[PDB]
Amino acid sequence: DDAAIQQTLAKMGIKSSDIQPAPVAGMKTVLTNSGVLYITDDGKHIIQGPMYDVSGTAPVNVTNKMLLKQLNALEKEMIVYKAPQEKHVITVFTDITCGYCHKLHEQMADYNALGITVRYLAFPRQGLDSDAEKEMKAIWCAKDKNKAFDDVMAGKSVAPASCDVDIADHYALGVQLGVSGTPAVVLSNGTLVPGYQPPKEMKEFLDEHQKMTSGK
Amino acid sequence: DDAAIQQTLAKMGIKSSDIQPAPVAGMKTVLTNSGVLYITDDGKHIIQGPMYDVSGTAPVNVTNKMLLKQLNALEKEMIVYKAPQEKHVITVFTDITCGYCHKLHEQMADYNALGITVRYLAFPRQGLDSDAEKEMKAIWCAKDKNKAFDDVMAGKSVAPASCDVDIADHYALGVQLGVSGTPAVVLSNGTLVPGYQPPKEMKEFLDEHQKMTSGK
């Protein structure tokens, strides 16, 4: 219905829309900066979601599955801190202006020593036309993103690199995934663990989560 | 720029738009019923295309690559006539009202005997709000699409099945691929061979094309 949909967004008050297919006849997936919506082809009906596929034994969140493929599409744009002996990979939506994001970053070595790899996406809590977006756009545009991020977090002045990377895409993904604060940890299954967990508590949580969700 | 784009289409006169990513900074792929376009994020500039990637030895048509993945996405909706000893697979955009489409279909056994598998998509030359779309929607909605297509082509009356299949998607793909007539043959590399070739000439063409494009 593919034009009528954008007329509906153009009175719902919606900016950075992206229309995706949905597994339900007559409906389509609509990714916004405010979340995932489901709209009928004619643009007349909105359903909040998420959506589940129960053509099998368990309910699979199809919304989370689709956002998991967006996330993996953004791996090139992640600032990754590899654990020397990787036991877990976590994705953190972070903001350079946030205090708990400093506290977490200062303990990166501790995370890594425990075998937790941390992959960063940018999530300015101030939203999109902000100084944090600007700073983080610059960091994510560095030749060495790891160094730029470390330097800026440490208080060092870093001349702003420029590239095509768009922090809006990271931010929208976060919002779509349920993020409402930083730092926010997203698990490999797409699970959001809001807020700060010290390295030790983090290792123990991830170990337990792994046991419980492994699949025997 | 993702809202501004649809404002530009909403004065270019565009119906069934779909916005895809593009490999060029600041630009996006726009699939329409009239062809593939490339638009800047701000919606101010249109480039006709197609697009090529020359970060390597040869020029790769990225537009054709992207349409090749749409085509393969539609395989579930194809009416496939398997060759017992498959040497070639071709995709035919066909119209049940077209005379050369009858002539081709009548020779299906001949195609298959020569090892040519034929996979049908619907392409109403009369466009989208037409009787041909309606008939072909019904055929593609049958429990046995092969039987429905054969029966309708043979002059037999077939009560209209209904389902979620949308002939608009087949038609738009064809137009996007360069189709301007039926029957139109699309090769596995995405090449359009417009119009009718008898089974024998078809086998010889495909054999030659295979030799020339194999890659040694």
UniProtKB/Swiss-Prot annotation, chains A, B:
Keywords: Disulfide bond, Periplasm, Redox-active center, Signal. Pfam families: DsbC_N (PF10411), Thioredoxin_2 (PF13098). Transmembrane segments: none annotated. It is found in: Periplasm. Residues 16-211 form the Thioredoxin domain. One of its GO terms (molecular function) is disulfide oxidoreductase activity. Disulfide bonds join C98-C101, C141-C163. GO terms for cellular component: periplasmic space. The keyword Disulfide bond applies. PROSITE patterns: THIOREDOXIN_1, THIOREDOXIN_2. Belongs to the thioredoxin family. DsbC subfamily. Homodimer. Required for disulfide bond formation in some periplasmic proteins. Acts by transferring its disulfide bond to other proteins and is reduced in the process. DsbC is reoxidized by a yet uncharacterized protein. Also acts as a disulfide isomerase. This is Thiol:disulfide interchange protein DsbC. The gene is dsbC.
